Subunit: 89 residues, 3 copies
Amino acid sequence: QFYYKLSQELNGDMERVADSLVTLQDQLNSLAAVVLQNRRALDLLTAERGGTCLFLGEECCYYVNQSGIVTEKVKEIRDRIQRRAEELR
Amino acid sequence: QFYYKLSQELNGDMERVADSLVTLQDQLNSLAAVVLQNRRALDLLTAERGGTCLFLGEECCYYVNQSGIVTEKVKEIRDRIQRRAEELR
Amino acid sequence: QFYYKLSQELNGDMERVADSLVTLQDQLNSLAAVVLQNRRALDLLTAERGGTCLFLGEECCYYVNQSGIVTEKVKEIRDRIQRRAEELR
Ligand SMILES: [Cl-]
C-alpha cells in the first residue's frame, strides 16, 4: 500500500521532469539554429577580415550540440516510469 | 517509518531538480533576449540585402520560446512536494 | 524489501536527471560563448553607431550566467544518491 503510493508519487514527479528536460532541449535546439545562422551572417559580413573570429582577433567559439544525450536519458526515464506503472497494474 | 523516509528523500531530490529546471529556463530566457537583439542588429545591417536570411540565401531560423511549459511543470512539482510535506505533518 | 526497491528506483531516475541537467547547462555554456562572441563582433561592426544597442536604438540585453547554481544542485543530488546507495550496502 505504501509501496504503491510512493511508486505513483515518483512516476508523477518524473513524468513532469522528463517533459521539462525535453522542452529545455527543444528550446536549446531552436535557439542554437538562430545563433548558428547569426554566426554564418557575421562570417559573410566580415569575409574580407577573415570571418568573425579573425575580425575580433579571438579564438573561435563553437557550439557543442549534445541533444542526443538528453533525448536518451528522457527515453530511459520514460521506460522506467512505464515499467513501474505496469508492475502496479 | 520507511514511507516517511522515502517521501522525504523524494521531496529533497525534487526540490533540487525543480530549482535547476527554473534556473535552466531563466538562462535560456536571458540568452534568447541577447540572440534576438543580435538578429535585429543583423537584419538592420543587411536591410539592403533583404535582411539576415536573404543575405545568406537561406530559410529563416526562428526561436520557439516554450518557457510557460517548464514554468507550469515546476509549479506542479512544487505543489506535489508541498502536498507530500503536509501529508507527513 | 519495498524500501530497498523504491530507494533503487529513485536513485536510477535521479542519476539520469542529474546527467541531463549537467548536459543542458553544458550546452547553455557552449551556446552563450558563441552568442557573446557574436555580440562582440556586432559591437565592433557598429562602433561608429555606438555599438549594437545604440545602433538599434534599444535597451541592451545582457546574459545572466547562472551555471554555478545548476552545478551545485547536481552535486547535492549526486551526494544524496551516493548516501542512499551506501545506506543499502
Ligand atoms: Cl547570436
